[PDB]
Amino acid sequence: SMNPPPPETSNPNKPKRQTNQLQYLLRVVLKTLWKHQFAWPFQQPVDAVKLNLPDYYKIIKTPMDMGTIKKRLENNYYWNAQECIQDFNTMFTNCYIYNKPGDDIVLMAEALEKLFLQKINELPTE
Ligand SMILES: CN(C)CCN1CCN(c2nc(NCc3cccc(Cl)c3)c3cc(-c4ccc(=O)n(C)c4)ccc3n2)CC1
């Protein structure tokens, strides 16, 4: 069973805007998580073939990852902060759906999520 195509990261016909919140989401929220010691499972789409997880995409129908988010912000794909916040939340939730409580990745996701929630709690006014 193969991997799906990655999520789209640009669309040349979408409108573009740069807002306070979108800047913060790339420069503060994504930056912080991306440079963290636990970012690496989350920096690219899950390759279920190379990572030997053949049921991954039987279970996870809305994949998401921070490499995709990073490119969506750099490309001005998002119009609203909430689109980006939703993507982060999808990413974390997928991890919690798929992986078992003993797995290190679960606690790594919990730690990153907590950082994420701190930074989103400080989302600058719109
Ligand atoms: C930090 N340094 C020391 C080592 C880094 N290398 C270890 C071997 N590599 C690796 N090893 C993955 N799984 C194996 C594994 C072994 C031990 C611990 C953990 Cl958390 C994961 C792995 C798992 C995933 C993965 C699996 C399920 C899932 O829901 N998500 C979101 C991500 C992604 C990349 C992955 N890279 C390439 C990177």
CATH code of residue 83: 1.20.920.10
Give the DSSP letter string of the chain: -PPPPPPP---TTS-----HHHHHIIIIIIHHHHHSTT-GGGSS---TTTTT-TTHHHH-SS---HHHHHHHHHTT--SSHHHHHHHHHHHHHHHHHHS-TTSHHHHHHHHHHHHHHHHHHTPPP-
CB neighbours of residue 37 within 10 Å: 8
Q: Among candidates 25, 39, 20, which has minimal Cα distance to 85?
A: 25
Do the domain assignments include residue 1? no
- Ligand 1 is surrounded, with C-beta below 6 A, by 40-42, 46, 51, 95, 98-99, 104-105, 108
CA of 79 to the centre of ligand 1 (A): 32
Do the domain assignments include residue 14? no
Do the domain assignments include residue 12? no
CA of 41 to the centre of ligand 1 (A): 5
The total domain count for the chain is: 1
Cα torsion 38, 9, 21, 87 to 10°: value is: -50
Residues spanned by the domain of 87 = 19-123
Q: Which atom of ligand 1 is nearest to the CA of 98?
A: 29
CA of 38 to the centre of ligand 1 (A): 10
Do the domain assignments include residue 88? yes
Write down the experimental method used for this entry: X-ray
- Whole-number Å distance between alpha carbons of 125 and 21: 7
Do the domain assignments include residue 9? no
- Ligand 1 atom 33: the closest Cα is on which residue? 41
- Whole-number Å distance between alpha carbons of 32 and 21: 15
